[PDB]
Design a protein around this ligand. Sequence first.
Ligand SMILES: [Ca+2]
Ligand SMILES: [Ca+2]
Lengths: 585, 585
Amino acid sequence: MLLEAIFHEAKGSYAYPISETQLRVRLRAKKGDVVRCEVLYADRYASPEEELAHALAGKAGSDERFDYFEALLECSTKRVKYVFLLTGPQGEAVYFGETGFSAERSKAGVFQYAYIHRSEVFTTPEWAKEAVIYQIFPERFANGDPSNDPPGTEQWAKDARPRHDSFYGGDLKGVIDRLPYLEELGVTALYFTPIFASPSHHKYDTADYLAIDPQFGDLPTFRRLVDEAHRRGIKIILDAVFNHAGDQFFAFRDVLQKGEQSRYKDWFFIEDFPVSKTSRTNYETFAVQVPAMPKLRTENPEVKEYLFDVARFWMEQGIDGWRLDVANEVDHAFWREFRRLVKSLNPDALIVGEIWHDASGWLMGDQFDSVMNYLFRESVIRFFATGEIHAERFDAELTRARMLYPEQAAQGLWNLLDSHDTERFLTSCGGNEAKFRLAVLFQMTYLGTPLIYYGDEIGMAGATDPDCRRPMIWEEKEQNRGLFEFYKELIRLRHRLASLTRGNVRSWHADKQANLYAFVRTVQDQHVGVVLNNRGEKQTVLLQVPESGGKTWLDCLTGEEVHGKQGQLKLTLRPYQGMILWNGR
Amino acid sequence: MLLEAIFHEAKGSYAYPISETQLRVRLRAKKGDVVRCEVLYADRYASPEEELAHALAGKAGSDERFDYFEALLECSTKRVKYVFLLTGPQGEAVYFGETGFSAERSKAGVFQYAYIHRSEVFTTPEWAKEAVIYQIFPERFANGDPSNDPPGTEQWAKDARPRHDSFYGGDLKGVIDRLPYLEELGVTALYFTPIFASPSHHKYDTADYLAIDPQFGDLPTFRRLVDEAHRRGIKIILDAVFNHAGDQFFAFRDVLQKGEQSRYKDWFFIEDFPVSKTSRTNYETFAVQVPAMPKLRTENPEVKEYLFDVARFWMEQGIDGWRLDVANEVDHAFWREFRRLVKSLNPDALIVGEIWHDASGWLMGDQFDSVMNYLFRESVIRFFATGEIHAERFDAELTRARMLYPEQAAQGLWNLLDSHDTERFLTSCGGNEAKFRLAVLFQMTYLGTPLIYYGDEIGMAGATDPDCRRPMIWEEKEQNRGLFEFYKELIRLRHRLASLTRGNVRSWHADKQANLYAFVRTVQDQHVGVVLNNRGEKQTVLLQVPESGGKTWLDCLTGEEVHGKQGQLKLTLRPYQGMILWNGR
Ligand SMILES: [Ca+2]
Ligand SMILES: [Ca+2]
């Protein structure tokens, strides 16, 4: 085999504990290069004469270029040393250890996970493990209070086409009045973009972190929303913009007024006084030259303490978690301490980050619980919407992403289809509902947390921002209730099948020609197979099904009963039809 | 080329800052697959059409199977996105980015280092970058006070052969009395194995963390050692055993007495009660069933606070650093907070760990400054002492180890030849002094911090523990002063040749037949080439020396001047001779 292509490291995403006495280990090798991967291990202080325990590393998956092997090590001493025994297609074997590769075990050396501390076991909120989150863009969801509308608010109608500076009056009172709707839909949590006091239309340039923006509501109303959502089994997640503040932030205005005499000049990154200009600025800001968004020096103990107080304040209001904005630009220590604070106040508070690149540095268990799965969105867009990639590529992309982080993170990644910053998925699908539905079916049965962008469930459409921010369609006759019932049904299924929320994922079938992809979700003895016919043609396929997993399945969407003959399952799917096969266990 | 063997990650040892505006990036590829590696980068918010910056990545080295390329990205904005352009032997142009490999730059995507915070720039003590440490085993270095000698103390003679339970009377006063000797040698720091109060001979089972063991001295004496050492330019490093305490430790004694009602039960890992008995252990200990060494629950904030107080106490006594014992079995948060405490009290205090496996998880810059370089010892033992490996293999092992961690850690790793737990290095060489000297010449000119085991500088020999712990030889007649002068000379050169303490390392020549290895240490315009003729034969070697780095060199050990002709340097080395060639810059 090709030894230079084989990889493992005793940490990060390749070695991490799932409990105090169990260590998961993963290894990658060029696809097809390794046929068998076994792990020989023992306590780090074990005598050189004792027998080593054995652990077979099953092939957890494979992407465009690699095969991924995964094993679980039982380490009652919480300390383990181990070496891999690798076998190729032609029977050639080799030991792989920290020292390197060798036909002799001793010369391969041994990898070591020094000690498994209970406090370092990646732990996430149980409720987030089976949640369906709904993204609320406040200004455009529901206008429950006309008296707080910004001046110049435009009419709330389906034919409305939003302009960058448009206003429709969406607010918290509206969300409250519409909680019955969200409850009927079945969402378990609401995620809000920024809602704190700000002079702009977007609110990403915070003026007051301790107040709800007047156009959206106030503290008493927010408290009411939290309470009303909670009794309906709906949690509240707020967006925290801690990387930078608005130029109206008390600390910044003070600096603008006193210059180098400000007690807060060091809460920011200023090059030289006086501090200001139009399109030009002597201080660091979000992105490039954004005057209204001065970057905060979170490394400053005072800044950090202040933001922590902000976090305490909202959590005292009863919120259930945070979505962090531009989190990759605030330091790690802040995030490690943020987590300690947050979890001490509420062990079930969720911490989600938004990083548009490999987020492994924030997903080891000491910082965020998860991040936005932009990779999922990209794979779903190109597979279901644009048709730029086929089923096998879709499979590879999905798998590569899956292997990026420890299972505790991957399990809670927010899998979005779109956002207030993208065109709506329906529009990406060129208005084709059959394509849109297949994507939703996949979204609701795949590994991760489904995130619904407001209005998508009733068939809203729209080009990218600001056209994706049209006012929510509330007139029942103008909503797509067929789609709505589809989401509701899929959501009910996700909650009834433990596999869909807490199961692992394995590719079941991938055909680039028929463009059919199938995968299986598994937990204990339960298996739920999902078959996706992503083609505008009726197609027949033969899936492999060794009798050990069962020989009878029920399509949870139609009630049809299918049977495997001699370890094979023949299926005929209608155009863009998706089946959710439950093995009855 | 083998794409599955190419590696990089935007963190850890492959992407890290050396300053607030400079990011070092490294890439690994199968040896020979890549002949040219360039990096195209820009600010993360740069417009798609803006011109990308260029940085050529020079080949930093090669080990058994891979080439390692390194580049320095200039990032004024402290935010950077980048993609590699790899050129193969046949001129194939391959782009490599977060997305993957592609012939098109856009499809390869881009790696991203979101933000460079000054607090995350790995920083180590300046004095430690050019230090020469001396390991003192207190019981055997010098007996300055017989009144504290334990009963049964044996004769202090060169012909003494220690037994497991022998006693010779070494103490702190002794060290003070011998400071003139240590100052002459030129050592800048003293590292002590455990010296706190303990009932055993070894003292790894701590009875009182706040007291010097009576047989070694008292607090007033320790203070005198700190002050006297300091005025001699010698710092003091203590061994901290925070993973476990002794069964005589007050908290544990209390647990053994009050059991379930003990205020300190959660300070340890207790299975059941009664707390203990002879030959039976119901509590976790260091290693396996070591009743005298109960593991401390450093995750317990009370234990943490107590150990931190211990650290505060000794630092108040003016010590300059800590060598951690069994550090990999104490949690990371404890080490991160420990570093924060230590550096806040004394930014120049050093923190060294002892981990017998990849220690990258502790060498990112937020925990330890360095660790013991056991890989260095293994390589020099096989290359210089036993002859198990040749020059090219030696080159490989060195290079591989060098690429394990960020440069700030590699630069300060403790390069030891032996220890109180191993046979003496001279003995490893079978008493061959010529071999011993070449290894020391190497130790004193290589990347890292030279650690001298007490007595090696005057020719002491010995089998492994306890024979390596013989009474220091203080009779000038019995000391190998020739060797002593050799050590003094090398330490002197190390101090005046900046490239030897702060320069990078680059293999210059490696030949498995002649068993000759040469490397170059570089800092700015200064180059110091070390040529090691590790063979019992006078040999001639032709080294490549492109005129850009100089045409004339001075061998700092002989005063011999050598000249290059047409980009080549002809050298003739005697058996086991080493040359230290300074380019006069
Ligand atoms: Ca309103
Ligand atoms: Ca004594």
